[PDB]
Amino acid sequence: DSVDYRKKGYVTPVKNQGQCGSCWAFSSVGALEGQLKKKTGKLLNLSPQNLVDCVSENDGCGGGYMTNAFQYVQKNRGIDSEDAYPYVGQEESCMYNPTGKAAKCRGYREIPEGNEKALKRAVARVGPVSVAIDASLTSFQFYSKGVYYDESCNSDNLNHAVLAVGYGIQKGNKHWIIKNSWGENWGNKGYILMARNKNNACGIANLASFPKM
Numbered sequence: 001d002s003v004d005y006r007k008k009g010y011v012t013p014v015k016n017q018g019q020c021g022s023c024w025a026f027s028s029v030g031a032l033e034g035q036l037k038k039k040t041g042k043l044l045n046l047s048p049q050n051l052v053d054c055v056s057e058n059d060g061c062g063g064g065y066m067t068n069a070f071q072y073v074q075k076n077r078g079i080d081s082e083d084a085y086p087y088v089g090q091e092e093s094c095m096y097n098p099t100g101k102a103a104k105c106r107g108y109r110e111i112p113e114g115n116e117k118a119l120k121r122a123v124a125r126v127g128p129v130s131v132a133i134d135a136s137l138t139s140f141q142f143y144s145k146g147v148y149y150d151e152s153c154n155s156d157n158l159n160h161a162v163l164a165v166g167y168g169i170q171k172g173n174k175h176w177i178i179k180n181s182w183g184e185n186w187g188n189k190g191y192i193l194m195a196r197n198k199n200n201a202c203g204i205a206n207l208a209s210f211p212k213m
């Protein structure tokens, strides 16, 4: 059992945060995009800028939480599209666009903390799932290929949000198919395969969630 939403057209191209710590915004957007495709058949970029500028509970370019983002989209009656609310790599005034909403959100669900099997079930039944991991390691920052696994990764040190678009096995190594938001020059075309069922490496399942659409 393995799934690759990229193969089903549930994933938009890899984005680049620019000089802004908006990992969580891209992560949330990637998740909503997946549900939008599943629900309507259309694959299009949602606005991470809309979240950066508007999610009051977060710190824009200084960090944030996907859950808060999903809550905002629901309470806000929607999120605009990238075309209607362009990414600028820096936090600005929350702008309202009457004809900008491209997607909706009915709330969200969290994956039971540390449960990698629950994470697998969610990814399979829902679609791409937002997750938080410890990305402070040089090995991760400079990851190139294969299945990433470092014994120094700290599951108690979540500092980066990415998107789980699937999971599988490579050369007998189970893994999570992760979409990053540091451009296509990072990792393998912007993607990284992270160890799966390897004792919850990097805390991949400590802060996972997806939106209800």
Ligand SMILES: *C(=O)[C@H](CCCC)NC(=O)O[C@H](Cc1ccccc1)C(C)C
Residues within 6 Å of the ligand: 020, 021, 022, 023, 024, 059, 061, 062, 063, 064, 065, 066, 132, 133, 158, 159, 160, 161
């Ligand atoms: C991902 O780009 C951001 C970068 C912030 C560091 C400049 N990391 C992040 O949002 O982590 C959040 C928790 C957090 C960390 C620091 C400040 C505020 C919030 C979770 C997604 C781990």
